[PDB]
Amino acid sequence: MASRILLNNGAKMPILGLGTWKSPPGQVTEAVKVAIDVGYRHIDCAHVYQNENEVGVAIQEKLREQVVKREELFIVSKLWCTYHEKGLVKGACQKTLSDLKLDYLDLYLIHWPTGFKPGKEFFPLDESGNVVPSDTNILDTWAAMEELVDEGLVKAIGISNFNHLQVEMILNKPGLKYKPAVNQIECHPYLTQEKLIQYCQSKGIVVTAYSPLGSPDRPWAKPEDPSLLEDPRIKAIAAKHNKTTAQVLIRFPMQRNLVVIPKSVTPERIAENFKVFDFELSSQDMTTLLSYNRNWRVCALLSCTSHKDYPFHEEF
Ligand SMILES: NC(=O)c1ccc[n+]([C@@H]2O[C@H](COP(=O)([O-])OP(=O)(O)OC[C@H]3O[C@@H](n4cnc5c(N)ncnc54)[C@H](OP(=O)(O)O)[C@@H]3O)[C@@H](O)[C@H]2O)c1
Ligand SMILES: O=C(O)COc1cc(F)ccc1C(=O)NCC1CC1
């Protein structure tokens, strides 16, 4: 298992990164410092997570300490849905850069295919509770992302939560200048994503798996929901390999040629989650984990199911 995967922009991306959604602002600086200290070189960020300033403090301090060099880090962020208009994309990227205290991003993603009305609210609502769309289409947002590459703000651009027809729309965009480098999607043994992964990989797009542990801290979790970390079948595979269940859940996507971005703010777990380059799941283990698919999503964007670009009505 090599530590990095080659992207279609010619750059290499670390296959293991640290997630930061829900990482409290008073804990995420130390989480990222610990992560870098114990070997992480890839941090997954987003403006909508409301903690990029604090992530940036950690990055800057580790650069200043010369624990790492900037070229060794791979920093990812994402354009929120209220910034899909062409006149807002650069400023949204620039706010992220200024918060992260960087002069470029390694990768900048369209966070969701759905554009929303611009304004202060991340989920602008009508009086009846529907999220108010933007009319700016996907393809025009992509052209604005391409301009960030040409301005030196970002090394690579990509997409997140795009279904295969939406990926295809960009690949088929008239005048396409840069292909997506990455599609970041939810993926774990309960949502195995074979069809969409195969499609993306066949086009040279690298897939990043988010919520690989099943996001036990997601704010809408219900007691009766399935739990990957507590699934006795996964625990058994972990025991056979003398690893933790989380370590198996992280190694699983790695062996599918995916990038994976587990989140933790717990120092012990941050270190645990990185010790996944010292064992191999068998093909039988992999197929067994794949067999647990139930099409179960952490992140279904349930407030946006009527948006024209809602991604999850299509099979994949
Ligand atoms: N593009 C998108 O739309 C999108 C959507 C979802 C997620 N993401 C990205 O993907 C990242 C990961 O997904 P996620 O945050 O939803 O969830 P996750 O990584 O599947 O799970 C995070 C949870 O697992 C716990 N945990 C971590 N390591 C553990 C271990 N070794 N043992 C036991 N529990 C452990 C964490 O607890 P502690 O933190 O308390 O240790 C936290 O509660 C996000 O943070 C974000 O960066 C992107
Ligand atoms: O957007 C994400 O990557 C993860 O969070 C979501 C996932 C959903 F299925 C639905 C909504 C959110 C959400 O409110 N996002 C904005 C701030 C919470 C970060």
GROMACS .gro file of N, CA and C in nm, residues 81-85 88 116-121 124 132-134:
model
   48
   81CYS      N    1  -2.282   2.567  -0.103
   81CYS     CA    2  -2.392   2.573  -0.199
   81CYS      C    3  -2.441   2.715  -0.226
   82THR      N    4  -2.423   2.807  -0.131
   82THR     CA    5  -2.467   2.946  -0.146
   82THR      C    6  -2.365   3.031  -0.224
   83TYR      N    7  -2.261   2.968  -0.280
   83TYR     CA    8  -2.158   3.037  -0.355
   83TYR      C    9  -2.143   2.980  -0.496
   84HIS      N   10  -2.248   2.918  -0.553
   84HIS     CA   11  -2.233   2.861  -0.686
   84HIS      C   12  -2.233   2.965  -0.798
   85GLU      N   13  -2.285   3.086  -0.776
   85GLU     CA   14  -2.277   3.189  -0.882
   85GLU      C   15  -2.130   3.222  -0.919
   88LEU      N   16  -1.920   3.481  -0.720
   88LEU     CA   17  -1.894   3.453  -0.579
   88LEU      C   18  -1.787   3.346  -0.555
  116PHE      N   19  -2.772   2.711  -0.393
  116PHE     CA   20  -2.873   2.778  -0.312
  116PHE      C   21  -2.861   2.929  -0.329
  117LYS      N   22  -2.968   3.001  -0.297
  117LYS     CA   23  -2.967   3.146  -0.298
  117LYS      C   24  -2.852   3.200  -0.213
  118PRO      N   25  -2.770   3.292  -0.267
  118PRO     CA   26  -2.663   3.351  -0.187
  118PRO      C   27  -2.716   3.439  -0.074
  119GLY      N   28  -2.637   3.448   0.032
  119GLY     CA   29  -2.673   3.526   0.148
  119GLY      C   30  -2.603   3.472   0.271
  120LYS      N   31  -2.643   3.523   0.386
  120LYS     CA   32  -2.574   3.487   0.511
  120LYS      C   33  -2.604   3.344   0.553
  121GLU      N   34  -2.723   3.295   0.523
  121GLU     CA   35  -2.767   3.164   0.569
  121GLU      C   36  -2.718   3.053   0.477
  124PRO      N   37  -3.073   2.879   0.303
  124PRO     CA   38  -3.177   2.983   0.298
  124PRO      C   39  -3.313   2.917   0.277
  132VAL      N   40  -3.416   2.744  -0.080
  132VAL     CA   41  -3.432   2.832  -0.194
  132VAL      C   42  -3.318   2.808  -0.292
  133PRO      N   43  -3.343   2.757  -0.413
  133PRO     CA   44  -3.233   2.730  -0.506
  133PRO      C   45  -3.176   2.856  -0.570
  134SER      N   46  -3.054   2.840  -0.622
  134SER     CA   47  -2.995   2.926  -0.725
  134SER      C   48  -3.032   2.874  -0.863
   0.00000   0.00000   0.00000
